[PDB]
Structure formats: structure tokens, C-alpha cells
């Protein structure tokens, strides 16, 4: 879903998520940046219920692109305990965006 909040609300609801969080940032303008889109699409749909998944313009929130310092586009972002853990940058294969996902659910 899309991150539609403002960056305070976003940091709030970031401390405050009881599930793990999962954050694209897309421009993207680019035909390896869709993919990654699609594949995070997908895994929203797998794990729907388990994990919250954002998808973020860097352009139209770049306070909170720059919070986390996105300085390219895809970049995929984990949170969990009201902190990002750890970050995917670019051409991300499927498997692995997944297999964040399931390092996360424990
Ligand atoms: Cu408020």
C-alpha cells in the first residue's frame, strides 16, 4: 500500500507497528525498478497479515527518503522495533526479498 502519511506520523507509526515493516523506494523510471515493484506487490499479497508493506515516491516524501538516506531507487527498507534493520539496494531478486521477509518473522 501506498505511504500516504507525513514523515512524523510515518516515524510514529514506525514505533509503534506490532508487525515488521517493509518499505519500497521507488522513483523509479527505470525497467529493473518495476520489477522490484511487481516482486514487492507479490510478496505484500504472500504475507499479507504478517508483514505491512509501504511503497514510497522518493519525490513526493523526500524528508523521510531522507531520514533513512535513500540516495538511489529501488531500495527496499526493513523495520522492526521501531527501527529499520536493514536495507536491499536495486535489482533485488525475488528469493531474497522473501527471504528477508522470513529472517524478520522470528
Ligand atoms: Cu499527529
Not at 52 to 66: G, Q, R, S, Y
Not at 77 to 101: C, H, M, T, W
Amino acid at each position: 500500500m501506498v505511504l500516504d502519511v507525513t514523515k512524523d506520523h510515518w516515524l510514529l507509526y514506525v514505533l509503534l507497528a506490532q508487525l515488521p515493516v517493509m518499505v519500497l523506494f521507488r522513483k523509479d523510471n527505470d525497467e529493473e525498478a518495476k520489477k522490484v515493484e511487481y516482486i514487492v506487490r507479490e510478496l505484500a499479497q504472500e504475507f499479507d497479515g504478517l508483514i505491512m508493506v509501504f511503497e514510497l515516491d522518493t519525490n513526493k516524501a523526500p524528508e523521510i527518503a531522507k531520514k533513512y538516506n535513500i540516495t538511489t531507487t529501488p531500495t527496499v527498507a526493513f523495520f522492526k522495533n521501531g527501527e529499520d534493520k536493514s536495507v536491499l539496494i536495486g535489482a533485488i531478486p525475488k528469493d531474497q526479498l522473501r527471504d528477508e521477509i522470513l529472517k524478520y518473522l522470528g
